[PDB]
Amino acid sequence: DADPTFDFIGYLETLPQTSGMYMGNASIIPRNYRKYLYHAYLAYMEANGYRNVLSLKMFGLGLPVMLKEYGLNYEKRHTKQGIQTNLTLKEESYGDWLPK
Amino acid sequence: DADPTFDFIGYLETLPQTSGMYMGNASIIPRNYRKYLYHAYLAYMEANGYRNVLSLKMFGLGLPVMLKEYGLNYEKRHTKQGIQTNLTLKEESYGDWLPK
Secondary structure (H helix, E strand, C coil), X not given: XXXXXXXXXXXXXXXXXXXXXXXXXXXXXXXXXXXXXXXXXXXXXXXXXXXCCCCHHHHHHHHHHHHHHCCCCCCEEEECCXXXXXXXXXXHHHHHCCCC | CCCXXXXXXXXXXXXXXXXXXXXXXXXXXXXXXXXEHHHHHHHHHHHCCCCCCCCHHHHHHHHHHHHHHCCCCCCEEEECCEEEECEEECCHHHXXXXXX
C-alpha cells in the first residue's frame, strides 16, 4: 500500500497556538473541508480513490502519532464548538485535492 | 517522508486469537525479536537504517490504526507475562530483516 492517511498528514502544518482546524466528525453534514480536519481527511481519501476511510475514532488516535512522524507537535483544545487543533492545510493542498 | 513504521506493520499477520507476540518494551534487555513486537520493531527500523524510532507509547497508539489500514483486526490482552497480541511475523520477515 501507500498508507494514504499518512500522506494526507503530509499536507498539514502546525500553528503557534491551538487555533487551527476543528476535529469535525461524520455527523456534521454540509461538509466543510477547510474548517473540519476530519472532513478535509475524507476529501483527500476520496480525491485519491479510497472508499475505505479511518473512523473519526481511529483517525483521532493516529493523528498524534503520524504528526510526530513528520516531526510536528499536535495540540488540541476543548471548545464551545468542539475540539480545535493547532493545524492548518499547507498551500499545495489547495491545488492538489481540496475541492474547489 | 518514508514512514517505515507502516512498512514494518506490513510484515504482520493476525491470529485467530490473542496468542501471538508480546508488546515488549525498551527495558527488557537481551532483546527477543521473535517474542516482543516492540523488539521486532526496533530490529526492522535498525535493519532499514533508521536511528529515530517511535517510542513504545507512540508505537502502541499507532499499531491499531496502521493495522486497520492493512485491513487487520488488532487484539491485545493483559497477562501474567504482560500485554499479549494476536499478531505474528509473516514469513518474508525471516529473510528480509529478522536477525539470524
